[PDB]
Write an enzyme that holds these catalytic residues in place. Structure first.
Site, PDB file in Angstrom:
ATOM      1  N   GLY A 164     -21.501 -16.212  13.477  1.00 23.76           N
ATOM      2  CA  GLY A 164     -20.189 -16.549  13.983  1.00 23.76           C
ATOM      3  C   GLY A 164     -19.371 -15.314  14.278  1.00 23.76           C
ATOM      4  N   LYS A 165     -18.662 -15.317  15.401  1.00 25.22           N
ATOM      5  CA  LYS A 165     -17.835 -14.186  15.787  1.00 25.22           C
ATOM      6  C   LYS A 165     -16.540 -14.713  16.386  1.00 25.22           C
ATOM      7  CE  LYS A 165     -16.836 -10.916  19.276  1.00 25.22           C
ATOM      8  NZ  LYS A 165     -15.641 -11.542  19.909  1.00 25.22           N
ATOM      9  N   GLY A 166     -15.470 -13.949  16.216  1.00 20.68           N
ATOM     10  CA  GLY A 166     -14.205 -14.306  16.822  1.00 20.68           C
ATOM     11  C   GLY A 166     -13.234 -13.153  16.747  1.00 20.68           C
ATOM     12  N   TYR A 198     -10.972 -13.117  14.637  1.00 19.41           N
ATOM     13  CA  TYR A 198     -10.795 -12.911  13.203  1.00 19.41           C
ATOM     14  C   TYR A 198     -11.786 -11.886  12.663  1.00 19.41           C
ATOM     15  CZ  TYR A 198     -14.949 -15.864  12.551  1.00 19.41           C
ATOM     16  OH  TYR A 198     -16.223 -16.381  12.576  1.00 19.41           O
ATOM     17  N   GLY A 199     -13.025 -11.941  13.125  1.00 20.80           N
ATOM     18  CA  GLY A 199     -14.094 -11.119  12.585  1.00 20.80           C
ATOM     19  C   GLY A 199     -15.438 -11.772  12.861  1.00 20.80           C
ATOM     20  N   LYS A 222     -18.880 -12.560   5.517  1.00 19.04           N
ATOM     21  CA  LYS A 222     -17.770 -12.558   6.455  1.00 19.04           C
ATOM     22  C   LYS A 222     -17.165 -11.160   6.484  1.00 19.04           C
ATOM     23  CE  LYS A 222     -13.845 -15.066   8.062  1.00 19.04           C
ATOM     24  NZ  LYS A 222     -12.630 -15.856   7.766  1.00 19.04           N
ATOM     25  N   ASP A 276      -5.849 -24.509   7.416  1.00 18.58           N
ATOM     26  CA  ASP A 276      -6.644 -24.251   8.618  1.00 18.58           C
ATOM     27  C   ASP A 276      -7.899 -25.111   8.621  1.00 18.58           C
ATOM     28  OD1 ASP A 276      -7.052 -23.186  11.096  1.00 18.58           O
ATOM     29  OD2 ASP A 276      -8.183 -21.448  10.369  1.00 18.58           O
TER      30      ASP A 276
HETATM   31  C1  LIG Z   1     -18.549 -15.911   4.104  1.00 19.96           C
HETATM   32  O1  LIG Z   1     -17.428 -16.754   4.285  1.00 19.96           O
HETATM   33  C2  LIG Z   1     -17.700 -17.888   5.103  1.00 19.96           C
HETATM   34  C3  LIG Z   1     -19.045 -18.299   5.327  1.00 19.96           C
HETATM   35  C4  LIG Z   1     -19.301 -19.407   6.142  1.00 19.96           C
HETATM   36  C5  LIG Z   1     -20.605 -19.900   6.415  1.00 19.96           C
HETATM   37  C6  LIG Z   1     -21.437 -20.331   5.353  1.00 19.96           C
HETATM   38  N1  LIG Z   1     -22.676 -20.843   5.545  1.00 19.96           N
HETATM   39  C7  LIG Z   1     -23.160 -20.974   6.785  1.00 19.96           C
HETATM   40  C8  LIG Z   1     -22.422 -20.572   7.923  1.00 19.96           C
HETATM   41  C9  LIG Z   1     -23.042 -20.790   9.212  1.00 19.96           C
HETATM   42  C10 LIG Z   1     -22.340 -21.449  10.214  1.00 19.96           C
HETATM   43  C11 LIG Z   1     -22.908 -21.694  11.481  1.00 19.96           C
HETATM   44  C12 LIG Z   1     -24.247 -21.314  11.716  1.00 19.96           C
HETATM   45  N2  LIG Z   1     -24.833 -21.605  13.066  1.00 19.96           N
HETATM   46  C13 LIG Z   1     -26.124 -21.068  13.451  1.00 19.96           C
HETATM   47  C14 LIG Z   1     -26.742 -21.849  14.623  1.00 19.96           C
HETATM   48  N3  LIG Z   1     -25.895 -22.203  15.650  1.00 19.96           N
HETATM   49  C15 LIG Z   1     -26.207 -21.682  16.807  1.00 19.96           C
HETATM   50  C16 LIG Z   1     -27.738 -21.866  17.106  1.00 19.96           C
HETATM   51  C17 LIG Z   1     -25.382 -22.299  17.935  1.00 19.96           C
HETATM   52  C18 LIG Z   1     -24.526 -22.288  15.410  1.00 19.96           C
HETATM   53  C19 LIG Z   1     -23.995 -21.468  14.231  1.00 19.96           C
HETATM   54  C20 LIG Z   1     -24.982 -20.699  10.727  1.00 19.96           C
HETATM   55  C21 LIG Z   1     -24.391 -20.435   9.449  1.00 19.96           C
HETATM   56  C22 LIG Z   1     -21.100 -20.032   7.746  1.00 19.96           C
HETATM   57  C23 LIG Z   1     -20.234 -19.571   8.957  1.00 19.96           C
HETATM   58  C24 LIG Z   1     -18.211 -20.118   6.672  1.00 19.96           C
HETATM   59  C25 LIG Z   1     -16.889 -19.709   6.470  1.00 19.96           C
HETATM   60  F1  LIG Z   1     -15.858 -20.408   7.051  1.00 19.96           F
HETATM   61  C26 LIG Z   1     -16.638 -18.588   5.661  1.00 19.96           C
HETATM   62  C27 LIG Z   1     -15.159 -18.140   5.437  1.00 19.96           C
HETATM   63  N4  LIG Z   1     -14.279 -18.100   6.588  1.00 19.96           N
HETATM   64  O2  LIG Z   1     -14.753 -17.820   4.363  1.00 19.96           O
END
Ligand SMILES: COc1cc(-c2cncc(-c3ccc(N4CCN(C(C)C)CC4)cc3)c2C)cc(F)c1C(N)=O
Length: 293
Positions: A11-13, A15-16, A31, A130
């Site tokens: 994930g990217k934005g 924010y970071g 993150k 949020d």
């Molecule tokens: C460290 O802190 C945070 C961690 C997470 C977090 C925890 N476990 C899993 C994910 C995660 C989300 C999405 C995907 N996908 C892969 C595949 N896809 C593509 C093929 C299109 C889409 C994206 C993989 C892993 C995340 C982001 C979340 C948070 F909000 C925080 C926060 N802000 O504290």
């Protein structure tokens, strides 16, 4: 942090970035906060550092790290390979059982945030501010957990103390309650932020319900207000739609032939009142979801 290798950016934005990393072979979520969002990194860290914040439906904390000289800010949590509810919903349909499991688990996590727990291993009341499908993660057990407490605000009933903090980042505009968009929100009232969470929760309920099959019919994944606002909508785009037009996510006709979706639609509207006071509490939503089962 010194014993973690960043493997892929999930994930990217502005924010970071959030990265999949390996920590001693175990996958972790990393993150990486921009220097501009340093306030969000600390808010999340101090909640995990001091508050007894552990629950099946809250993203599990592992570690936080920071080095400033320039400045790199890391927040390391458990990694959920199924990704966000936002990602998961685009790829799978649901039945009654799995839809209810998802939304009851979100409601359970939100209630645990909102509820003040007195005692030693207790917690203050917390509002999220949020909440959105991208900030909710899908676990392999079919339940969800809430992430990103960077905007959270705390309250202790004993001292009547409200820690809101100054954060330049505001909530995600697509999910802002009408009182936020028209700026009538009582900014020094903790109840106001809980009711903001309830509004956003209603929108997430709508996102999930569309993906529940009934009688061979299912909608596609759509974000709230997809049909009336552009992508990355402006504050003013949202305010016109929510406050002037008084629009709300439409209920598809086929929902009214299914008892679960009809009950979910009723729940949704009781999250969407313009009057923040009229909105149901998180605990009440959890109880109603439980009776639906
Ligand atoms: C460290 O802190 C945070 C961690 C997470 C977090 C925890 N476990 C899993 C994910 C995660 C989300 C999405 C995907 N996908 C892969 C595949 N896809 C593509 C093929 C299109 C889409 C994206 C993989 C892993 C995340 C982001 C979340 C948070 F909000 C925080 C926060 N802000 O504290």
């Amino acid at each position: 942090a010194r014993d973690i290798t960043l493997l892929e950016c999930v994930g990217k934005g502005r924010y970071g970035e959030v990265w999949r990393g390996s920590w001693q072979g175990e996958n972790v979520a990393v993150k990486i906060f921009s220097s501009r969002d340093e306030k969000s990194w600390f808010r999340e860290t101090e909640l995990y550092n001091t508050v007894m914040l552990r629950h099946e439906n809250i993203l599990g904390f592992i570690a936080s790290d920071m080095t400033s000289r320039s400045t790199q800010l890391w927040l390391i949590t458990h990694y959920h390979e199924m990704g966000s509810l936002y990602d998961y919903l685009q790829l799978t349909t649901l039945d009654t059982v799995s839809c209810l499991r998802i939304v009851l688990s979100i409601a359970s996590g939100l209630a645990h945030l909102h509820i003040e727990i007195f005692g030693t291993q207790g917690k203050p009341a917390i509002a999220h501010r949020d909440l959105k499908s991208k900030n909710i993660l899908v676990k392999k057990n079919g339940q969800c957990c809430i992430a990103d407490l960077g905007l959270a605000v705390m309250h202790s009933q004993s001292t009547n103390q409200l820690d809101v903090g100054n954060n330049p980042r505001v909530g995600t505009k697509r999910y802002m309650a009408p009182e936020v968009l028209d700026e009538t929100i009582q900014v020094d009232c903790f109840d106001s932020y809980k009711r903001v969470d309830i509004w956003a929760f209603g929108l997430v309920l709508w996102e999930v319900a569309r993906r529940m099959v009934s009688n061979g019919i299912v909608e596609d994944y759509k974000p709230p207000f997809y049909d009336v606002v552009p992508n990355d909508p402006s504050f003013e785009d949202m305010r016109k739609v929510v406050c002037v037009d008084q629009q709300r996510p439409n209920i598809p006709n086929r929902w009214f032939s299914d008892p679960t979706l009809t009950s979910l639609a009723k729940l949704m509207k009781e999250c969407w009142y313009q009057n923040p006071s009229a909105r149901l509490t998180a605990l009440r939503i959890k109880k109603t979801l439980t009776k639906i089962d």
